[PDB]
Amino acid sequence: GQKINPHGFRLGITTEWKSRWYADKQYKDYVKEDVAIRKLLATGLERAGIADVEIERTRDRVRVDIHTARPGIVIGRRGTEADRIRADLEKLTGKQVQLNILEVKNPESQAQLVAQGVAEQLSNRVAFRRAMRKAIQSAMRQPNVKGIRVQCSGRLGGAEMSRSEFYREGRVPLHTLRADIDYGLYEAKTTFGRIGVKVWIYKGDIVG
Amino acid sequence: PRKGPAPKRPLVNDPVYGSQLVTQLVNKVLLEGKKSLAERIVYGALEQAREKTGTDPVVTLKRALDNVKPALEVRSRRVGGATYQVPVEVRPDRSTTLALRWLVNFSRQRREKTMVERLANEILDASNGLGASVKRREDTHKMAEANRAFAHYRW
RNA sequence: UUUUCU
RNA sequence: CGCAGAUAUCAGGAGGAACACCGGUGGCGAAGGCGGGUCUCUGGGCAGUAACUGACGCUGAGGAGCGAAAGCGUGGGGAGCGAACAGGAUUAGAUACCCUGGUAGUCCACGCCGUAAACGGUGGGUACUAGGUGUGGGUUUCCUUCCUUGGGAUCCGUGCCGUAGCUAACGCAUUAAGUACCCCGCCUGGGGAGUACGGCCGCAAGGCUAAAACUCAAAGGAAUUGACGGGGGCCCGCACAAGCGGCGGAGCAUGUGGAUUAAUUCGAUGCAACGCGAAGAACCUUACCUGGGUUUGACAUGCACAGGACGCCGGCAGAGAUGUCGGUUCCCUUGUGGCCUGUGUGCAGGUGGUGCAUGGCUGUCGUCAGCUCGUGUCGUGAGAUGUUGGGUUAAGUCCCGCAACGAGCGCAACCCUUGUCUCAUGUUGCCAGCACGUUAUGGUGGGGACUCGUGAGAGACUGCCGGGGUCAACUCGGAGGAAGGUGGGGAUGACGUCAAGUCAUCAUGCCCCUUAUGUCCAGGGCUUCACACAUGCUACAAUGGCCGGUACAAAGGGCUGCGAUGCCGUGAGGUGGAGCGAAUCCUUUCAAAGCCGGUCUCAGUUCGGAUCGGGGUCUGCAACUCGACCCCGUGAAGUCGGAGUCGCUAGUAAUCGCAGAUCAGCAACGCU
Ligand SMILES: [Mg+2]
Ligand SMILES: [Mg+2]
Ligand SMILES: [Mg+2]
Ligand SMILES: [Mg+2]
Ligand SMILES: [Mg+2]
Ligand SMILES: [Mg+2]
Ligand SMILES: [Mg+2]
Ligand SMILES: [Mg+2]
Ligand SMILES: [Mg+2]
Ligand SMILES: [Mg+2]
Ligand SMILES: [Mg+2]
Ligand SMILES: [Mg+2]
Ligand SMILES: [Mg+2]
Ligand SMILES: [Mg+2]
Ligand SMILES: [Mg+2]
Ligand SMILES: [Mg+2]
Ligand SMILES: [Mg+2]
Ligand SMILES: [Mg+2]
Ligand SMILES: [Mg+2]
Ligand SMILES: [Mg+2]
Ligand SMILES: [Mg+2]
Ligand SMILES: [Mg+2]
Ligand SMILES: [Mg+2]
Ligand SMILES: [Mg+2]
Ligand SMILES: [Mg+2]
Ligand SMILES: [Mg+2]
Ligand SMILES: [Mg+2]
Ligand SMILES: [Mg+2]
Ligand SMILES: [Mg+2]
Ligand SMILES: [Mg+2]
Ligand SMILES: [Mg+2]
Ligand SMILES: [Mg+2]
Ligand SMILES: [Mg+2]
Ligand SMILES: [Mg+2]
Ligand SMILES: [Mg+2]
Ligand SMILES: [Mg+2]
Ligand SMILES: [Mg+2]
Ligand SMILES: [Mg+2]
Ligand SMILES: [Mg+2]
Ligand SMILES: [Mg+2]
Ligand SMILES: [Mg+2]
Ligand SMILES: [Mg+2]
Ligand SMILES: [Mg+2]
Ligand SMILES: [Mg+2]
Ligand SMILES: [Mg+2]
Ligand SMILES: [Mg+2]
Ligand SMILES: [Mg+2]
Ligand SMILES: [Mg+2]
Ligand SMILES: [Mg+2]
Ligand SMILES: [Mg+2]
Ligand SMILES: [Mg+2]
Ligand SMILES: [Mg+2]
Ligand SMILES: [Mg+2]
Ligand SMILES: [Mg+2]
Ligand SMILES: [Mg+2]
Ligand SMILES: [Mg+2]
Ligand SMILES: [Mg+2]
Ligand SMILES: [Mg+2]
Ligand SMILES: [Mg+2]
Ligand SMILES: [Mg+2]
Ligand SMILES: [Mg+2]
Ligand SMILES: [Mg+2]
Ligand SMILES: [Mg+2]
Ligand SMILES: [Mg+2]
Ligand SMILES: [Mg+2]
Ligand SMILES: [Mg+2]
Ligand SMILES: [Mg+2]
Ligand SMILES: [Mg+2]
Ligand SMILES: [Mg+2]
């Protein structure tokens, strides 16, 4: 092992839990249903990037909040994907299920969706060179974000070898706990196999 | 020890009598870290020696340590593909510590059937000059004065 | 002191 | 080699080679080379006058001579040294490096051969081109003592550093590899080859002129970064040194190797695998082997032909799957949704292969401190500076001048715990001070005066002083303080290396089976052994075994689970079951070692307990291969251990205990 994920390392200080609920007796069934529904949603929705999925449970009622790149296909003008998701959850027997859609402010200020875009560009036809160049430029353009580091591992260009290349700009102080790091990870598909992309983003500092 | 001489612990004194030599002896004979057992055994053997000899235990212990403490030792050294021994003077503190060590070593390995009495008897023998400890000191001095020739190395 | 071969 | 008179010392004598102190990067000769002293003959060189000759100058194929050491012929001498050859010692082998002996030779006179890295690896002659700085010889002029490396001018020889220039670079530099002219040899890719034949010379050794076939697609010259050294310098780590206890000899428990078996499922193989993936192998897990069924299938989905059945609770046959029969049967509503029984269609299905294709995760170098980028500058070019030297620190932490100016990952900090104090705070927790208990203890009414458990703040920052320091970093000592010079331990792995582990976690590209390598079940296995290795407990007896009395802690687990009191069992445990989703009830008042009293007087032992037999308890439908616990008989090896090798520097090393993870039952001496 080389590096521990900054999210897990810094859980107790900066980032908060993305799921909050108390139970001990039905805790097994509850965790089973949450992990299930999360996996089913992940495998069902791929067209639209979903940043994070947070679930809060209050007795029988459960509320799920979704962050996505753009709501156009996440929720239809008449509620196509919304009704499909509701029907899915009802089949999974989530009891009373309520849906909310929350929209991110800066599309490329966070790790998940930039990772999705880079994976898509790498997979379809785009070269990793231009992929990294455009991703870094777009991430830089935003003033709030300061440091970005993108790493790609796997087979690149179809060559029969593994290339581990990373490009870095700005802040990457993972040792400093006070710093703010955003971690993302997704796998890019291709004809010859699978490629993993990892990106780190630094966004200011927090005191308090 | 690369940086320099390390600090030395402030060894405590014996309140029963008033000599830290008793503390040193009990610490040396400590087996499996049983302080109460070791100290009670040492006190019992000291009383046995006292009743056997009819004299002062502290005085006879001082006599024994004075008789058995060496002043010259032998150190091993190999130079030019050949092994040699050199004699080097020793600080009296280390001499006393090693004398206690030999006292324990030769109080470990004799066949008197009861070590509580046997350690006292060994102390009497060392005081009288018939002890294995004094025999070992004789041998050490003989070796040192035999290897005196190679003293030119001075290490 | 000496200390072969990949 | 001597004890037949050695080594040692004093006197005397014989004989051969070479000359320390002068003596040097000094002098002389064309180059080889040349120095103990005196005498005889002899060559060359430089400065001045410039009297004389009046172009008489350079060069040089063939040719002639000289020419380091070694070797040969003829004749002498032979002190020391010493090829060849004997022995001694090391090495597996020494025909050597080490040692004791020793024949040519090293010397002399007379003839021979004519070869070297005979290198300044750079021919001779001529005229020109900035200087500084030593050294030898000869003449001149002036401070002027006119002594004096005082100073000035000039010819020749010999060193170092330096511009223009040249040079691929290293480098040259008035003694040019600089600008110019005359003369002579040399060579046109490496091996083949300075070799074959011929010729010349020579007694021989041998030397001088020098070919062709064949074969290769490179051979070599400079310079840059890594890597390496049995190179040097400057420093750090239980690396060594002083100490503690261990492994390797015995019994047992796990993992592997090696051999069998139809199978003992697969992977990992020094550091960096070997109480591993196995936090619980009789069915399951297993995928291994035999056998019996099975089929678009145990399990999902879309397309056509058949439909409202499917789905379920029981009797019968069977090693079991499974086959046949008894009891219920749609919820919607006319289109069918849900579900699936028979035909397939695609296709499911694989712990089958590929970590030399991969994602993710992980171990080591190493918690070592090193590793980079922007601009500039230098060189042509691979590149260099920044990252060099001195001082200091645990650290690329910092200070000083320097073609460097800045920045980055790292280091410290911010996070947890532990060391103190202040405030808030009283129940299921404690009791200062008052009352009730009266043997059961705050048990009960009461109470923050401290811990007790969880919230806020302060406190270590070289804070201050004295000396060293470039007045700076940094260091020693001292006062206050709980802590003094990162207080202690933790969370925390920079770029990269080991094609390191993991398709047996999961997913993933390709090949392979599909009527099987898929799928359900009955029994067996992973626990087999004539041996080996690694990690642990028991020890090998008195610091002790055994018996009776006896006081001191932490933290956590408990719902289909802990389990009180009581009763019966030696004890496994049997009945029963208060208190508990838990500071309350259980895990005993949490003990062991510890202290007192008694036996053993050193034994194969009252230490020590494995192996083998006879009786029971507990969980499980199922204890023979194959679990654990209690009682009895059984009484084996083993007396501190071989070369070798391991951990440990303060609550540290040693020794003795408690709870939990997987779990109905345990392989529990392993792990936390
Ligand atoms: Mg840090
Ligand atoms: Mg003599
Ligand atoms: Mg010469
Ligand atoms: Mg003359
Ligand atoms: Mg004239
Ligand atoms: Mg001649
Ligand atoms: Mg000669
Ligand atoms: Mg000859
Ligand atoms: Mg001759
Ligand atoms: Mg002769
Ligand atoms: Mg002679
Ligand atoms: Mg010999
Ligand atoms: Mg010799
Ligand atoms: Mg000789
Ligand atoms: Mg030659
Ligand atoms: Mg010339
Ligand atoms: Mg000159
Ligand atoms: Mg120049
Ligand atoms: Mg040239
Ligand atoms: Mg050049
Ligand atoms: Mg020069
Ligand atoms: Mg010249
Ligand atoms: Mg050729
Ligand atoms: Mg040749
Ligand atoms: Mg020839
Ligand atoms: Mg011939
Ligand atoms: Mg070359
Ligand atoms: Mg070279
Ligand atoms: Mg080297
Ligand atoms: Mg250390
Ligand atoms: Mg050691
Ligand atoms: Mg052992
Ligand atoms: Mg062993
Ligand atoms: Mg074991
Ligand atoms: Mg195997
Ligand atoms: Mg092993
Ligand atoms: Mg092994
Ligand atoms: Mg282990
Ligand atoms: Mg099996
Ligand atoms: Mg099995
Ligand atoms: Mg395989
Ligand atoms: Mg493999
Ligand atoms: Mg290294
Ligand atoms: Mg340039
Ligand atoms: Mg450099
Ligand atoms: Mg450099
Ligand atoms: Mg610098
Ligand atoms: Mg460096
Ligand atoms: Mg740094
Ligand atoms: Mg109270
Ligand atoms: Mg690294
Ligand atoms: Mg590999
Ligand atoms: Mg490999
Ligand atoms: Mg596959
Ligand atoms: Mg695949
Ligand atoms: Mg296949
Ligand atoms: Mg199959
Ligand atoms: Mg089966
Ligand atoms: Mg097994
Ligand atoms: Mg044990
Ligand atoms: Mg009973
Ligand atoms: Mg008790
Ligand atoms: Mg026994
Ligand atoms: Mg027994
Ligand atoms: Mg026992
Ligand atoms: Mg024995
Ligand atoms: Mg014995
Ligand atoms: Mg040994
Ligand atoms: Mg269990």
UniProtKB/Swiss-Prot annotation, chain A:
The keyword Repressor does not apply. One of its GO terms (cellular component) is cytosolic small ribosomal subunit. GO terms for molecular function: mRNA binding; rRNA binding; structural constituent of ribosome. Residues 37-105 form the KH type-2 domain. Keywords: Ribonucleoprotein, Ribosomal protein, RNA-binding, rRNA-binding. GO terms for biological process: translation. Belongs to the universal ribosomal protein uS3 family. Part of the 30S ribosomal subunit. Forms a tight complex with proteins S10 and S14. Binds the lower part of the 30S subunit head. Binds mRNA in the 70S ribosome, positioning it for translation. Binds 2-aminothiazole antibiotics, which are antitubercular agents. This is Small ribosomal subunit protein uS3. The chain holds residues 2 to 209 of 275 of the full protein.
Curated annotation (Swiss-Prot), chain B:
The keyword Transport does not apply. GO terms for biological process: translation. GO terms for molecular function: rRNA binding; structural constituent of ribosome; tRNA binding. PROSITE patterns: RIBOSOMAL_S7. Keywords: Ribonucleoprotein, Ribosomal protein, RNA-binding, rRNA-binding, tRNA-binding. It comes from the Bacteria. One of its GO terms (cellular component) is small ribosomal subunit. Pfam families: Ribosomal_S7 (PF00177). Part of the 30S ribosomal subunit. Contacts proteins S9 and S11. One of the primary rRNA binding proteins, it binds directly to 16S rRNA where it nucleates assembly of the head domain of the 30S subunit. Is located at the subunit interface close to the decoding center, probably blocks exit of the E-site tRNA. Belongs to the universal ribosomal protein uS7 family. HAMAP family: Ribosomal_uS7_B. This is Small ribosomal subunit protein uS7. It comes from Mycolicibacterium smegmatis (strain ATCC 700084 / mc(2)155) (Mycobacterium smegmatis). The lineage of its organism: Bacteria, Bacillati, Actinomycetota, Actinomycetes, Mycobacteriales.
